[PDB]
Amino acid sequence: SGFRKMAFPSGKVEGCMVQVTCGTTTLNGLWLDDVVYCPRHVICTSEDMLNPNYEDLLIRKSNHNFLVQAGNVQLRVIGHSMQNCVLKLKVDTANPKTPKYKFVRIQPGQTFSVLACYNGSPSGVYQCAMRPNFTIKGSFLNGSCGSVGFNIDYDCVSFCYMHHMELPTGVHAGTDLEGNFYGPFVDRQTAQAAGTDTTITVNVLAWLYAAVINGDRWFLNRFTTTLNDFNLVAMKYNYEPLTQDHVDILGPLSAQTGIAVLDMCASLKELLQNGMNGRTILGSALLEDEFTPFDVVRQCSGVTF
Amino acid sequence: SGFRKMAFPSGKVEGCMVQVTCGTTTLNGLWLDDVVYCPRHVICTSEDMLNPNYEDLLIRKSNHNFLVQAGNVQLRVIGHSMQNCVLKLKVDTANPKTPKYKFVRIQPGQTFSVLACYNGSPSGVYQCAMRPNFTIKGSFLNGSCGSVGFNIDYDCVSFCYMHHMELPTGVHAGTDLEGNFYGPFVDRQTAQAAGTDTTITVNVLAWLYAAVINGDRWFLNRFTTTLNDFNLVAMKYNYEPLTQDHVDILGPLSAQTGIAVLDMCASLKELLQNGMNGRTILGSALLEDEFTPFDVVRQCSGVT
Numbered sequence: 001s002g003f004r005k006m007a008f009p010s011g012k013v014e015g016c017m018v019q020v021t022c023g024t025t026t027l028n029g030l031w032l033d034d035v036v037y038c039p040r041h042v043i044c045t046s047e048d049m050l051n052p053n054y055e056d057l058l059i060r061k062s063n064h065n066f067l068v069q070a071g072n073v074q075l076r077v078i079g080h081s082m083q084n085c086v087l088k089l090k091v092d093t094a095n096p097k098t099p100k101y102k103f104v105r106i107q108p109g110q111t112f113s114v115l116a117c118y119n120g121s122p123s124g125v126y127q128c129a130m131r132p133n134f135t136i137k138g139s140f141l142n143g144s145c146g147s148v149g150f151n152i153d154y155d156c157v158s159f160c161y162m163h164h165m166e167l168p169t170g171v172h173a174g175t176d177l178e179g180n181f182y183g184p185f186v187d188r189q190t191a192q193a194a195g196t197d198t199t200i201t202v203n204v205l206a207w208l209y210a211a212v213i214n215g216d217r218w219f220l221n222r223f224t225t226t227l228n229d230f231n232l233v234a235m236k237y238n239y240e241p242l243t244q245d246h247v248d249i250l251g252p253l254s255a256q257t258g259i260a261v262l263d264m265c266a267s268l269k270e271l272l273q274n275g276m277n278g279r280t281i282l283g284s285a286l287l288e289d290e291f292t293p294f295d296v297v298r299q300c301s302g303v304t305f
Numbered sequence: 306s307g308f309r310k311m312a313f314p315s316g317k318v319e320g321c322m323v324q325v326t327c328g329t330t331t332l333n334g335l336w337l338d339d340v341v342y343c344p345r346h347v348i349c350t351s352e353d354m355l356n357p358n359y360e361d362l363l364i365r366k367s368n369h370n371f372l373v374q375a376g377n378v379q380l381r382v383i384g385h386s387m388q389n390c391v392l393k394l395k396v397d398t399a400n401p402k403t404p405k406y407k408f409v410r411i412q413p414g415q416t417f418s419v420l421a422c423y424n425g426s427p428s429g430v431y432q433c434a435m436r437p438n439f440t441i442k443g444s445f446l447n448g449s450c451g452s453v454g455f456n457i458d459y460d461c462v463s464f465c466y467m468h469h470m471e472l473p474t475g476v477h478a479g480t481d482l483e484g485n486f487y488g489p490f491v492d493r494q495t496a497q498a499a500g501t502d503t504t505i506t507v508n509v510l511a512w513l514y515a516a517v518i519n520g521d522r523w524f525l526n527r528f529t530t531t532l533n534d535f536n537l538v539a540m541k542y543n544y545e546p547l548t549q550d551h552v553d554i555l556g557p558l559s560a561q562t563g564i565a566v567l568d569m570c571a572s573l574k575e576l577l578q579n580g581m582n583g584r585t586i587l588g589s590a591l592l593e594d595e596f597t598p599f600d601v602v603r604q605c606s607g608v609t
């Protein structure tokens with residue numbers, strides 16, 4: 001038993017991280033087969049970032065301006081191109097450690113593991129949810145750009161995130177592995193507002209079920225509610241509306257615990273209206289929303305990879 | 306910026322995880338050079354676990370009773386011995402993915418990453434602290450035994466923990482890699498009291514520094530205190546005493562923020578005496594004690 005924010009084992013992704021230097025800037029790249037993917041702002045100087053013309057900046061670059069190093073072995077770049085906001089450097093050698101992999105664009109509220117990297121070397125791994133406003137609350141210092149987020153399915157690494165930038169508010173934004181930003185953000189150093197961030201309601205309910213499975217039951221009650229009625233109070237507290245799709249997703253945790261989904265909503269309704277009254281749930285004094293229902297099932301069932 | 310609970314990359318350790326079976330039981334083993342390390346209760350039946358005689362049980366076993374699988378490469382066992390609560394299976398093949406490594410016995414309050422494994426396959430990785438009463442609050446299901454905890458410095462894996470059991474309270478206990486339990490626990494299915502647990506004061510202070518580095522300043526006050534005054538309050542609130550060694554280890558964080566250690570103690574004393582008033586620090590409504598000063602320095606500096 002026990003419940004912890006758990007990241008996927010990072011070994012498959014560690015062997016794909018390289019260092020990409022383009023004169024002034026060094027960040028991280030992903031080496032899959034004979035292509036290195038990295039944020040295209042590697043080609044910007046400091047002052048370029050205010051209003052970069054990326055097509056013009058790319059045209060002034062030659063392959064020899066791209067120093068790619070895997071370990072203390074330099075990779076010979078034989079071409080460069082640009083897919084949306086991701087640079088793609090063609091290299092002379094395919095990565096022998098290339099795992100089976102997919103590129104995937106995740107949805108708000110889904111989670112993934114971040115392998116935080118500096119100078120191409122992995123530094124640590126942690127779990128992250130894509131917020132409803134398409135930001136993530138990670139831990140990223142200068143030079144962390146190009147770090148990637150991923151999920152693992154047995155043997156297949158599904159890459160879903162590449163880190164590009166920290167907003168002035170200190171939250172983080174990036175792209176899928178096709179270079180498309182999550183959310184409305186752009187890769188230029190301008191002030192950019194993230195929309196209103198809401199709480200991932202379906203993830204809070206999944207975590208409450210995690211709590212019951214692990215022995216925390218005090219918040220359970222004997223009250224009913226409809227989906228519509230729960231949503232009327234959820235919006236007051238800046239919770240995402242709960243849909244029938246979410247109820248269906250939570251089905252298996254309902255069955256394992258014998259607590260109907262709408263009964264668990266009635267328990268959350270009372271937690272939002274009356275607070276915790278100084279009590280904790282799974283060692284936390286706040287309602288946690290960065291566990292998906294699949295996250296809980298996996299951690300309380302022990303799936304391996 | 307930002308501040309997260311962060312595990313070490315697990316790749317070097319993934320390459321050492323193997324599956325160990327002995328008749329009934331299957332659990333995880335750690336394969337370094339030509340030795341596989343695993344909990345000795347792999348040789349128990351469930352009837353055995355109430356009061357196992359490990360000496361006698363081991364005598365009934367031969368090398369060929371031990372099934373060791375690395376992927377599905379089958380390792381041949383050519384020797385076995387018991388060291389404290391750990392079995393050492395000598396195998397005919399050195400692990401070619403053996404990293405540079407050390408065996409280390411950590412101190413209460415220190416942190417480490419856990420690679421939770423089942424049937425020898427990695428499932429997930431997360432960061433844990435060794436509580437002052439020598440339990441850990443992990444996530445372990447049946448079959449996770451033999452999962453290991455470790456820190457990584459540059460290229461060297463320091464193994465500090467192997468998981469053996471869940472106590473009736475739902476907390477977890479285990480050994481160093483020489484088979485010595487942390488705390489008073491023994492590997493039998495009996496009710497066993499862990500001590501009174503306490504909050505790791507030096508870790509809370511390091512985490513308050515992390516908050517100031519990340520912009521949280523509301524808890525900084527105009528008071529100060531002394532080491533002795535603070536420690537009087539620490540004891541009333543079941544916090545570990547604060548020593549000069551702890552002050553020294555906080556020195557680098559004090560230098561970066563310009564907040565002297567005893568001024569941060571005065572902030573914490575105020576938080577303990579008046580509570581947090583429903584406010585948050587770094588996304589938490591509780592005082593967080595599972596970051597060491599080194600954890601904070603490393604995450605706020607980018608060590609790889």
Ligand SMILES: O=C(Nc1ccc(N(Cc2ccsc2)C(=O)Cn2nnc3ccccc32)cc1)C1CC1
Pocket residue numbers: 024025026041042044045046049140141142143144145164165166167186187188189190306
């Ligand atoms: O490129 C260069 N500098 C250079 C400067 C700023 C940036 N920016 C703004 C920006 C605007 C659109 S995208 C990126 C970042 O947010 C980089 N970032 N990301 N995570 C960070 C966490 C902490 C600190 C910085 C972090 C990107 C690049 C040349 C070396 C001079």
Ligand SMILES: O=C(Nc1ccc(N(Cc2ccsc2)C(=O)Cn2nnc3ccccc32)cc1)C1CC1
Pocket residue numbers: 001329330331346349350351352354445446447448449450469470471472491492493494495
């Ligand atoms: O009985 C067998 N194995 C076997 C069973 C139980 C156990 N025990 C008690 C015990 C007391 C001193 S040592 C071991 C554990 O706590 C194992 N544990 N650890 N983490 C767990 C998290 C959730 C559930 C169980 C967990 C240890 C070994 C043979 C295979 C049939």
